[PDB]
């Protein structure tokens, strides 16, 4: 019934293309298209890991109590902004052992909703109500890179990189839940297969993107640097 333009750029046109690609369109159906899209995006971001949904940010360690941000889903490289240094993640028992038994390497763990560090780190960041003030990040400022949970659509004008990069993915993953809402199985299976194929293509692209500029050959690393 409804019309739509060639590019599905925004939520407003996606919620109409959904009803178009499925003639099952009416009052009792269009009102829940938002819920189907919500379920589809949740099913997507639950396991999708790609750059465009990443986010880098400084942390405040406070030697221990340091807390995990709300948007934490998976941690990428973690380091500082001074001469470079990469942390490695270990288990709580290793850190508890390090505490008593005893600074080039630095470890960390995940205690519930915290990030513990064996050394008494003193990373500094501006407080909450600070107005602007980039602060010219001081030293001992760790920078964390992780995968952040993207926002949920709340306005027809609201767009997202997924719409501009792969709208068919959302359209199929939401037609799945649509054909589930109504009684239909063939469409469910076909849309699920197509969405899974698109997601596989995207993750394979991400894979072929990483470490894709030259071959590798470990040069028999046996710690040439031992003197220190």
């Amino acid at each position: 019934m409804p019309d739509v333009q060639y590019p599905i750029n925004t939520y407003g046109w996606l919620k109409k293309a959904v009803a178009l690609w499925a003639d099952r369109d009416d009052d009792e159906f269009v009102n829940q298209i938002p819920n189907f899209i919500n379920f589809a995006e949740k099913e997507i971001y639950r396991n999708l890991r790609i750059p465009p949904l990443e986010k880098e940010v400084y942390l405040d360690i406070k030697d221990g109590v340091a807390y995990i941000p709300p948007d934490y889903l998976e941690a990428q490289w973690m380091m500082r902004a001074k001469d470079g240094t990469i942390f490695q993640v270990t288990s709580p028992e290793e850190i508890s052992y390090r505490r008593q038994h005893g600074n080039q390497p630095v470890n960390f763990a995940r205690f519930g909703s915290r990030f513990i560090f064996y050394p008494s780190i003193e990373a500094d960041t501006p407080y909450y109500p600070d107005d602007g003030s980039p602060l010219i990040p001081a030293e001992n400022s760790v920078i964390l890179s992780y995968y952040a949970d993207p926002p949920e659509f709340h306005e027809d004008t609201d767009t997202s990189t997924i719409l501009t990069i792969a709208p068919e993915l959302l359209l199929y993953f939401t037609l799945r839940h649509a054909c589930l809402f109504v009684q239909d199985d063939n469409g469910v299976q076909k849309w699920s297969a197509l969405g899974k194929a698109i997601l596989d293509e995207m993750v394979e692209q991400n894979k072929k993107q990483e470490y894709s500029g030259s071959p590798i050959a470990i040069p028999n690393n046996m710690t040439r640097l031992q003197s220190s």
């Binding site: 639950r46 940010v57 948007d71 909703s113 960041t125 600070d130 949970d149 949920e152």
Partner: peptide
Amino acid sequence: IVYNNQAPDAVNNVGQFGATEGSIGAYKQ
């Protein structure tokens, strides 16, 4: 590149850490 100093505006509709519809009020208060 940025800091987490902005104010709470929404809930984690996807994500096992953070806030919920029954806890966002606490964050805002």
